[PDB]
Amino acid sequence: AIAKMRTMIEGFDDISHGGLPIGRSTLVSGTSGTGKTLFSIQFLYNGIIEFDEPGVFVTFEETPQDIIKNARSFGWDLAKLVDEGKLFILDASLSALIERINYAIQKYRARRVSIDSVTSVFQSSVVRRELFRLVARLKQIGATTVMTTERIEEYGPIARYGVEEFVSDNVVILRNVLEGERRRRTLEILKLRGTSHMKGEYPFTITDHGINIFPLGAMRLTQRSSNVRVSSGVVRLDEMCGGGFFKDSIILATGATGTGKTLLVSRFVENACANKERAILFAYEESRAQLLRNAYSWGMDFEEMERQNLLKIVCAYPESAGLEDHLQIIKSEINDFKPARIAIDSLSALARGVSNNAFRQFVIGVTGYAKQEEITGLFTNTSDQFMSITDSHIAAITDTIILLQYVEIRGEMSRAINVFKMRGSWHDKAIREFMISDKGPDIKDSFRNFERIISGSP
Amino acid sequence: AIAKMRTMIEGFDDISHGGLPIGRSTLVSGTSGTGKTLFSIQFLYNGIIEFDEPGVFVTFEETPQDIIKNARSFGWDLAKLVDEGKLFILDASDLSALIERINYAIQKYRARRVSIDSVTSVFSSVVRRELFRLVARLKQIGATTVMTTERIEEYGPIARYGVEEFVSDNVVILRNVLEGERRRRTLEILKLRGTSHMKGEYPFTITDHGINIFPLGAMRLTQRSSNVRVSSGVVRLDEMCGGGFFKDSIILATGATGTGKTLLVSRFVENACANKERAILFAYEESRAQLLRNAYSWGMDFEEMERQNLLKIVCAYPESAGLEDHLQIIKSEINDFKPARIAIDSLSALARGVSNNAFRQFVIGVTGYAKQEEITGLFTNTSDQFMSITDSHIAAITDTIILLQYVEIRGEMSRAINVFKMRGSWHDKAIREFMISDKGPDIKDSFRNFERIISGSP
Amino acid sequence: AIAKMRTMIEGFDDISHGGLPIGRSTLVSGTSGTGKTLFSIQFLYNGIIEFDEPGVFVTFEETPQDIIKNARSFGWDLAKLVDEGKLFILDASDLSALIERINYAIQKYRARRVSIDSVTSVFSSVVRRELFRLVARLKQIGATTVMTTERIEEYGPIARYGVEEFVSDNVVILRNVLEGERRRRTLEILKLRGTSHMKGEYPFTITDHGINIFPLGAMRLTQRSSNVRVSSGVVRLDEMCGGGFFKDSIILATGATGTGKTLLVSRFVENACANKERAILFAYEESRAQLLRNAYSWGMDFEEMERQNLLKIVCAYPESAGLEDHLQIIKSEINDFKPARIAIDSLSALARGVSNNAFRQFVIGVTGYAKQEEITGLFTNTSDQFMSITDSHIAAITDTIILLQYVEIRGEMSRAINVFKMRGSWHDKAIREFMISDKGPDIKDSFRNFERIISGSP
């Protein structure tokens, strides 16, 4: 088999099980601002601060000083590594270039090489022969190169002259697709000669750590399962769940608007902080100010928990970022605070004007990470119809579902709670009446008289 | 990192995270009449009207006289600034010759800011070589340049020869997309080599003040929340809400046509003018004439309040402007009148033949601003069916929902009201019938004889 | 008729009705990384590894060393065959000169098969004249050639200059269409001058064995059917089915979330391992961890069966691969483990954001194979509404349908099971209520007090 080299890019090594083929050159074409330079810089940088491999960078447009300054925003200096003799920024902004580049390879331990960019170098018949010569001349030296080419259309031709794709051994497309006034970064591997890889696009983001590729296909169902129970915050609800929620489980609170989803989330988050356990609250519908007042009215101090460094509140609008970003933000915030419990209020708000598949691929990401890090996730979902079906087919991700619906009785609005699922546990299969007070919720008995709920009244 | 310069354009300082990279040039492409020249002038202008930095202006097609004549429209004299020495409009009626004149004028007034409108006149393989030489000679002078490009398609190639983006360090695209015979201005940053920015299209308008960018992403979920309550105009309604509406809250009055939504809006505004508090009425369904007749019929003198400078009525058809304009008009008017209560009649009318995405982002922009300005807002919504739900997922924005519906009883069409939800407050969970007279709402008792009304037919 | 040659590529021998026309050449066009070179090698390879026929290989861009290095990946040494004389890789570093060298090498080893990868390198009016001369000089030598072309668009012009199809006797197009960020390999025969073939696109995958074409059309309705019955894990269920499921049959367990579909799958697999019979569990909703916990909770040791080599659990996310892969993975695993019972949990999860056409053709490919392998299959389907139908038209594939649904009775959520249909058997036509415990299903009696359940709300 062809030996792959680890680029040390979070996700990319999963997409191409191993990394990039050693001895050959990888073509990374993409529209302007797709992260071609970043990828090629991050490739060389990773290969010097992990395997101390002497890499050479070829410039064709941007000056060396520009590349150094631009890469300084990611929190790494290139001039320091150039000073050490571990990097070489060959400034060039025909055949001799190959021999000059080859010279440095043998004169600075030919590890990794990047050429950003070649499109301006050869700025469609001549393109082939010129591109065919370079790759061949780089094969003889047997060093791992990355070539960055530009494309005009996001789903149009692979490159500018539409020829490089065949000439190259490896093809990587960086996309910056715009849908509904929103840009979605995706990276896909078009081909890998004599090796296997993951097919199709994969959502990625660019932060202070660099390119953060989020593979969904590498996510496997290995989430360890325990019989460890944890109090939901309601004694009556814990009895109804046959002891309370499972430490390694995903609880779903679906219902109509004003039913008490946030209440159950608040009470679930308070419980963590009572037992001196860390918890994160991801708000998307309400603000910290409104959350603190709302909790206060039920008799729960959210400031107290914040002062004890046991509860964190992250409020933000869904339309203020993308699903890729939102997921990263959760992971980053979870990576720092490392909570025992988590609550997303809510997924319904996060599904507002988003690809039904882009949202579906987000839920798995959050659900999986929570399960894979042994964190109890409670996600709320507001139903569009007042007074009910999932209508999303995402009930196969949740291990527990709390139903909250209104019951119009004697020209009076009354609320009702019920547990549908409790995988690996017994649950009370009754529709108990509950109401809200200054001391929180109170679950009473069920309605034996009216047997026609999840519809109307009698 | 990379030092950024403030452009002092409302919204661009948030979308850019701080502004435009210092020392480097920014390319602004767009179709004709997008606001390229405007952005160009406004950049240099605020430079010499805030940080007092001498900026030179290169004009190729448009003559200085015209530039000043057009600039005046917004309300700022350029010739006065040309007269002093803070700005120099270098009329451009070979690159080296032009570059020399620009370079020899950048040291004369020691210009910090530079705008070239436009570089798509002087002029694919040659455009790159010329453009590369231009930015290189401007990079050496360490002057923050702004270059304006020209495109033919709105979602087609970024520039004319589709090569000006890879040569530029920064790329700002201004669009003017036509959807259902309606023109929507949008601004997006494609890339910023070095720093970070906000990805995606952001709606903006051009008024007397200049460009007015409304970033919905920059708007955080930091909205002050108090337990201060206020009246609604109805004593029983205040009592039904458990002391009346919250000062800092968004109330929603949804129901079938002729249920009495406008009645609740009227009384809501009246009560404001009763406590000598200023309010605004945004009508999109009925005129001042009909409102005054209907109000006067209900025993509420809207002329009086109008003369007392406590009530301002602004009527205009929903299809008389875009959501962008309607929002900017609401904000402008609010800032002028500085009201404590605001009522919109209605959102349903504002959703008339408008994309759910563009409508979604408008309701967030209105509710968000009112919440951050400590202004109590009552928004009405007319349901499609007489006998329903919550339109879409705008129930996450309203802190209170007052449902009103009809109840056919013994061949009579009686109306019923109920506080469906109230966050942070107790509310009457009863469906009380109410009559309308020339005195206003008459909330009586609920219907215990028949329990199947609410969001149902009985 | 026209004599055809077997390529020995799984599926191509059925789609072609027998293979490629003998004496004539075949043109294989496709975008980059479709599998043109692979198909090229695999053709010649099987030639000299089955019918022991010396085949020569023309390489234009890719060097012999690379071709052998890439070929190795699949698991076959080319240099060994080059060493012997069964294959000769004629490196192509004027037509008459090249044609001469090919013609002078086709008589040396007396080559029966020939591949030219690729003819889109050497090179609209001239391409025809050259191509026509090439096939004419290969027709005279009566050698089955295979020419690889290159296309830019997936559903655009067949070849580059769109003239290589009318000059060729045979045209095979390899596609790699991207639909919702997912890459789907497809192979179609456009025409075969002389013989007949299968019209339309056919899904195929590339694995370690090489190209793997899955013709759904070639699959006939010849599926052995016996009166041999088997148990389900439940005595009452076997009795309710009129002696238990048929050995050769497809059973479907559809219903709302948490109804007990996984319970029935578990017991179904357990019973197999009870009679010392091998089974496979294909999970796409829950992990091994959760399954083992849930199983153990139900009184079924999935570790034991795992250690007894009677039960194999394979969990993986539905969006972790394409239907093509999932199918090929199921077939591969089945052939290895050779199980008598198979259960998929679930099809609904496998339909998550997938075209109804691509999903339809996957269920036919799975059910068809299991039916022709004498393997009893239980497939689960989670309904969108809690309280429904048969998803789509997949009821024509299932020989037995076990419906499970909830029945709100006196403010209690009880579950009900019923054998909806059973072909070739009597079944209990009664809606019997059933409870769940740590011992498994408890099928009790039906509800004679209320006759309005089934696919209704009462």
Ligand SMILES: Nc1ncnc2c1ncn2[C@@H]1O[C@H](COP(=O)(O)OP(=O)(O)OP(=O)(O)O)[C@@H](O)[C@H]1O
């Ligand atoms: N500190 C940062 N935080 C977040 N994102 C950043 C940061 N620095 C840069 N970026 C992002 O990465 C981009 C860097 O552009 P880059 O040069 O990697 O793209 P490219 O595809 O090579 O562009 P081109 O080849 O057209 O010049 C910026 O435009 C921005 O979107």
Ligand SMILES: Nc1ncnc2c1ncn2[C@@H]1O[C@H](COP(=O)(O)OP(=O)(O)OP(=O)(O)O)[C@@H](O)[C@H]1O
């Ligand atoms: N202090 C209180 N006393 C009594 N009842 C209260 C109190 N605060 C809230 N409630 C009741 O509980 C509801 C609050 O529910 P919650 O804030 O959890 O909203 P939700 O069900 O998540 O709906 P949404 O997210 O759509 O607003 C109010 O609508 C009201 O009916």
Ligand SMILES: Nc1ncnc2c1ncn2[C@@H]1O[C@H](COP(=O)(O)OP(=O)(O)OP(=O)(O)O)[C@@H](O)[C@H]1O
């Ligand atoms: N005083 C004003 N009030 C409101 N809108 C104005 C005012 N003055 C100009 N506008 C708007 O802004 C536009 C001016 O755009 P500008 O002159 O910058 O064009 P441009 O983007 O440079 O395009 P081009 O170069 O093709 O002329 C007008 O077409 C109009 O829609």
Ligand SMILES: Nc1ncnc2c1ncn2[C@@H]1O[C@H](COP(=O)(O)OP(=O)(O)OP(=O)(O)O)[C@@H](O)[C@H]1O
């Ligand atoms: N003076 C009055 N006396 C009695 N009933 C009245 C009087 N004026 C109006 N009404 C009643 O109340 C209604 C007034 O309409 P209102 O503005 O309260 O409803 P709306 O929900 O705003 O209707 P629309 O959806 O058409 O805007 C009339 O249709 C009528 O039934």
Ligand SMILES: Nc1ncnc2c1ncn2[C@@H]1O[C@H](COP(=O)(O)OP(=O)(O)OP(=O)(O)O)[C@@H](O)[C@H]1O
């Ligand atoms: N060992 C392997 N296991 C699985 N898949 C493989 C393996 N080796 C190669 N592949 C797949 O097959 C592809 C090889 O295709 P091939 O080299 O024939 O390209 P091609 O169709 O000739 O295109 P081009 O001429 O543009 O390179 C790889 O891109 C990869 O997706």
Ligand SMILES: Nc1ncnc2c1ncn2[C@@H]1O[C@H](COP(=O)(O)OP(=O)(O)OP(=O)(O)O)[C@@H](O)[C@H]1O
């Ligand atoms: N040990 C137990 N004792 C009692 N009841 C149990 C026990 N374990 C599970 N249950 C009940 O049976 C259900 C188990 O889910 P099961 O896998 O049988 O349903 P499912 O149809 O596969 O659900 P989903 O659609 O979510 O996959 C729980 O929701 C609970 O109601």
Ligand SMILES: [Mg+2]
């Ligand atoms: Mg770049």
Ligand SMILES: [Mg+2]
């Ligand atoms: Mg809530």
Ligand SMILES: [Mg+2]
């Ligand atoms: Mg202009």
Ligand SMILES: [Mg+2]
């Ligand atoms: Mg009205």
Ligand SMILES: [Mg+2]
């Ligand atoms: Mg090839």
Ligand SMILES: [Mg+2]
């Ligand atoms: Mg299940």
